[PDB]
RNA sequence: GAAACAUCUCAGUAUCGGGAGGAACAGAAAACGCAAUGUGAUGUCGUUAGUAACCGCGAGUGAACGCGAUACAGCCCAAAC
RNA sequence: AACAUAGGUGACCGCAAAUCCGCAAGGACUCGUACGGUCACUGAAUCCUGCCCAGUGCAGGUAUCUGAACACCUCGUACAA
């Protein structure tokens, strides 16, 4: 391509001789500072900035998840047949999640429920899933 | 049933012990680098560590120098932080316990040695015992225990040159799970050096 | 200069209400400095010039030095911090 | 390198001193700490992860527990008598 | 015309010294001892070499003031910072 084409033309890149070199000066970044127009020039990304972001409990001894969705539990039923087994009433809940890593097991609340109207049991639930829950049908879970 | 020579080694200042320490290391002392010695200083810790009477055994005492500093003065490219630079005031990371183990076994090139540790030692130089065992000897390579230190010498060889014995591996590690990182996963070696 | 030393209204703190009158303090007390990150990291890493132990340090200072003075809202008698200005003096 | 530079960085690198083997070194918990009615010597490989942590909190630096693998192996003194 | 020089002068030191080398073990001066030998300035002879101790340097003293850490006391912390 216009790489492969190197030959022909004297200098590569930019065209200069004497061109681009060791530049502008400091290595990598110049430094995060002022100097004698070396490299500056207002910047914010960072602005705060210590890249990432941590939580000391965040790690071992945090709390864990899995979460669930009040959307693929109702896509899940009544509307199309799916998981037969764990099937009773016009519907029930437990667990279909794809880890069952501990700590876990709540369902949130987002999309239009019940519809189903399902009753789901799991560890704790969101107030916006409680809702659009207990409504039509749904209820209580893992007392 | 040793139990006081370990009880008496404690103050070194108690009593009886103390006369002894005055009347001593004064014939120590007066006394160079390299003796040998019919029985271990303190009969507990030797016959602890490992020294019983039997052929192919010697232990020997070893006196040192004060405290530790002695060091040359770096060339120029001083100016700086200084980094590696200082003079007295850097303390060298071998013990003078270490560098008693060997300074025996070079010494005696035929044996090895479990070591042992210091008497103590005043006004300057600590002392050490120091058992080793000599490889090629016969009682030696017959009581289970005592043996291994010399198969003949495959795989241990200059053991306190490598390192492995009592106090080097310390110093250089200690502990196990925890406080082991940057320390041995085997060592220093890998990991690259703390 | 020597003002406000008033009776105000503004009181937006922890404890507040209507706001009422407050007035001046320019408190001063307290321990000073070496609280924070300085005594604790000479501590420790101390051999030749590790952090910026060798540059002066919090800035230079200048004529003035701003102004502390808290306002205490006279009721509640807790309150908070304003800006400060750089006053030539305080009386 | 940090577009200078002192900590930091290059780097525990280059180079130096001593020494073993066919492999070395480690190694049967005063461990771990997904805190548990849980794991169960040690290397190493993959990952955990550029994560926690460090740092003119600048530039840069930078693990581990665990997990999946490989290979598996547990024992002898000192003392008491 | 520069250096050296004899000559002039000042300084430190009684020797387990002054001065200097070495990381240390040790070492030069020194088979030396003040009519010595170390450290400096001036630079044969002749006539001479004034005034200044404020600043800087060195040295001596110093009621009072300032002046680190250990140990000591008080507070704080069941300990510690």
């Known amino acids: 391509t216009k790489t492969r084409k190197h030959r022909g033309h004297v200098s590569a890149g930019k065209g200069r001789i004497g061109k681009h070199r060791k530049h502008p000066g400091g290595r990598g970044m110049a430094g995060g500072e002022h100097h004698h127009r070396i490299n500056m020039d207002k910047y914010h990304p960072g602005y705060f900035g210590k890249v990432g972001m941590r939580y000391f409990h965040k790690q071992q001894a945090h709390f864990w998840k899995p979460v ?43 999309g239009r429920i019940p519809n189903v109207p399902v009753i789901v049991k799991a560890r704790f639930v969101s107030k916006l899933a409680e809702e659009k829950i207990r409504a039509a049908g749904g209820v209580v879970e893992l007392i | 049933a040793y139990k006081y020579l370990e009880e008496l080694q404690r103050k070194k200042q108690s009593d009886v012990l103390r006369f002894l320490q005055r009347v001593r290391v004064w014939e120590y002392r007066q006394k160079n680098v390299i003796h040998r010695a019919a029985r271990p200083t303190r009969p507990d810790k030797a016959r602890r560590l490992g020294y019983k009477a039997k052929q192919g055994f010697v232990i020997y005492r070893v006196r040192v120098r004060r405290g530790n500093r002695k060091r040359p003065v770096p060339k120029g490219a001083t100016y700086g932080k200084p980094t590696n630079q200082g003079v007295n005031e850097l303390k060298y990371q071998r013990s003078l316990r270490a560098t008693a183990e060997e300074r025996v076994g070079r010494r005696a090139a035929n044996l090895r040695v479990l070591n042992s540790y210091w008497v103590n030692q005043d006004s300057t130089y600590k002392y050490f015992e120091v058992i080793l065992v000599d490889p090629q000897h016969k009682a030696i390579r017959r009581d289970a225990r005592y043996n291994w230190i010399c198969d003949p010498v495959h795989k241990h060889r200059e053991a306190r040159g490598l390192t492995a014995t009592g106090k080097k591996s310390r110093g250089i590690n200690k502990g196990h799970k925890f406080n082991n990182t940057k320390a041995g996963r085997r060592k220093t070696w890998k990991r690259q050096n703390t | ?69 808290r306002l205490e809202c006279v009721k509640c008698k807790t309150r908070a911090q304003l800006t400060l200005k750089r006053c030539k003096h305080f009386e």
């Open chain 3, 1 to 69: 200069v020597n003002v406000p030393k008033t009776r105000k209204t503004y009181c937006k703190g922890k404890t507040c209400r209507k706001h009422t009158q407050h007035k001046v303090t320019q408190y001063k007390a307290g321990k000073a400095s070496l609280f924070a990150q300085g005594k604790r990291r000479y501590d420790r890493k101390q051999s030749g010039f590790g952090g910026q132990t060798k540059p002066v340090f919090h800035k230079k200072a200048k004529t003035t030095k701003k102004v502390v003075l």
């Open chain 1, 68 to 110: 669930l969705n009040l959307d693929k539990l109702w896509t899940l039923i009544p509307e199309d047949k799916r998981d037969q087994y764990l099937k009773s009433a016009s519907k029930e809940t437990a667990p279909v999640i794809d880890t069952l890593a501990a700590g876990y097991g709540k369902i949130l609340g987002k």
